[PDB]
């Protein structure tokens, strides 16, 4: 259970990293 | 203690995710 | 095609928002037991 | 250039989707949901 939750946390790091990238790309496209 | 701490971490990351989802939604409409 | 891609972005975002809601729902049940 | 940038956005949201699918499956298995 602890080990699985640790992997959940680690994979969510990637989810947020990818989303940050998306936001940043849209900001430069719209000129923000 | 560890499960509770990890659940808290999950919930903090989800909070950040929700905000980012909101931002993508706002930004893409402006395109 | 820009409009097509904006629609695709929106559909993906909706899918991803549901999955985040699923993570929130499920993690509370691990926490619970 | 809007097209290339939006294509890149779609690809990255697909990665997001992949990762979230993995996380959701992992938590269902933890709670015994199928
Ligand atoms: Mg990735």
Curated annotation (Swiss-Prot), chain B:
Region spans: Leucine-zipper: 6-27
Domain notes: Residues 89 to 100 and 106 to 125 define the N-terminal activation domain (NTAD) and the central acidic activation domain (CAAD) respectively, which can function independently to promote high-level transcription of the target genes.
Annotated localization: Nucleus
Name of the protein: General control transcription factor GCN4
Function text: Master transcriptional regulator that mediates the response to amino acid starvation. Binds variations of the DNA sequence 5'-ATGA[CG]TCAT-3' in canonical nucleosome-depleted 5'-positioned promoters, and also within coding sequences and 3' non-coding regions. During nutrient starvation (low or poor amino acid, carbon or purine sources), it activates genes required for amino acid biosynthesis and transport, autophagy, cofactor biosynthesis and transport, mitochondrial transport, and additional downstream transcription factors.
Positions spanned in the full protein: 251 to 278 of 281
Organism: Saccharomyces cerevisiae (strain ATCC 204508 / S288c)
Record's subunit section: Homodimer. Each subunit binds overlapping and non-identical half-sites that flank the central CG base-pair in the pseudo-palindromic motif 5'-ATGA[CG]TCAT-3'. Interacts with the mediator tail; the interaction with GAL11/MED15 is direct. Interacts with the SAGA histone acetyltransferase complex. Interacts with the SWI/SNF chromatin remodeling complex.
Processing after translation: Phosphorylated by the cyclin-CDK PCL5-PHO85.
Induction: Translation is induced by amino acid or purine starvation, or during growth in low or poor carbon sources. Translational repression during nutrient-rich conditions is dependent on four uORFs (upstream open reading frames) present in the 5'-UTR of the mRNA; these promote ribosome dissociation. Translational induction occurs in conditions reducing translation machinery efficiency, leading to ribosomes scanning over the uORFs, and increased translation of the mRNA. The rapid translational induction is followed by transcriptional induction at later time-points, independently of the uORF sequences.
Record-stated family: Belongs to the bZIP family. GCN4 subfamily.
Residue intervals passing through the bilayer: none
